[PDB]
């Protein structure tokens, strides 16, 4: 249900994720690390399942951030893929893939993998 | 099929992987980088399904290499997980995880992920 996903979320390392879920399945917002301030802010775009199974099943979603804004360009992009689980304490559990632009010779070591848990703080 | 795993395989980057598959599931051997100078060699150990399914299924397998030998110690370990497919053109299709020993602060960026296809050519 779009309303439950929409809000301000934070992960275990102190990074900020502000997102709005639209009724057609679109996700839009901004991502920021713990330093706060204006720019550490990057644009994010994603999709979610706007018609989830009932049960106590989670809602599947995913989003991408290319690490370039008007102050820095790290030449890399991260994609998070996971599920929104609502209830008393709503959480988004994910796994992510960070790929950097490399030359052909170093392409075998271009991608990092990891996992993040977001806890909600505001709509 | 089964024992067809024993032999010398090469991935797409020229690294060589020599393995012995034990009747009950063990995998033992050595891995060495391209250039191939004799210590670029590292020890590997692993497991595989010793009784695979009889329909057209591949054979599940996996192995680990800690990147330390008598000459170099790169403070990392790689695990490959995949499946063996026998035929006139045999191959082992895998994905791998490379973790480095890091401090607590750099733990989030400790692991790389990739994929490799090993053939006997």
């Amino acid at each position: 249900a779009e309303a439950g996903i929409t809000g301000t979320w934070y992960n275990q390392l102190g990074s900020t994720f502000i997102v709005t879920a639209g009724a057609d399945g679109a996700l839009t917002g901004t991502y920021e690390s713990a330093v706060g301030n204006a720019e550490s802010r990057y644009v994010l775009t994603g999709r979610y399942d706007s018609a989830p199974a009932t049960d106590g099943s989670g809602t599947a979603l995913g989003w991408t951030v290319a690490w370039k804004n008007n102050y820095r360009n790290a030449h890399s992009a991260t994609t998070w893929s996971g599920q929104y689980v609502g209830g008393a304490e709503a959480r988004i559990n994910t796994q992510w893939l960070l790929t950097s632009g490399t030359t052909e010779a170093n392409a075998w070591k271009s991608t990092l993998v990891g996992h993040d848990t977001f806890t909600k703080v505001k709509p | 099929a089964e024992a067809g795993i024993t032999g010398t395989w090469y991935n797409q980057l020229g690294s060589t992987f020599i393995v012995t598959a034990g009747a009950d599931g063990a995998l033992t051997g050595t891995y060495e980088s391209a250039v191939g100078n004799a210590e670029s060699r590292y020890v590997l150990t692993g497991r595989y399904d010793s009784a695979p399914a009889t329909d057209g299924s591949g054979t599940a397998l996996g192995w680990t290499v800690a990147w330390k030998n008598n000459y170099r110690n790169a403070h990392s370990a790689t695990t490959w997980s995949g499946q063996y497919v026998g035929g006139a053109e045999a191959r082992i299709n895998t994905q791998w995880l490379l973790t480095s020993g890091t401090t607590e602060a750099n733990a989030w960026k400790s692991t790389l992920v990739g994929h490799d296809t090993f053939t006997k050519v």
Binding site: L13, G14, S15, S33, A34, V35, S40, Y42, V65, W67, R72, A74, S76, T78, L98 | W108, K109
Partner: peptide, 6 residues
């Protein structure tokens, strides 16, 4: 220092 995390 990558901006994803601190």
């Amino acid at each position: 220092c990558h901006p994803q995390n601190t």
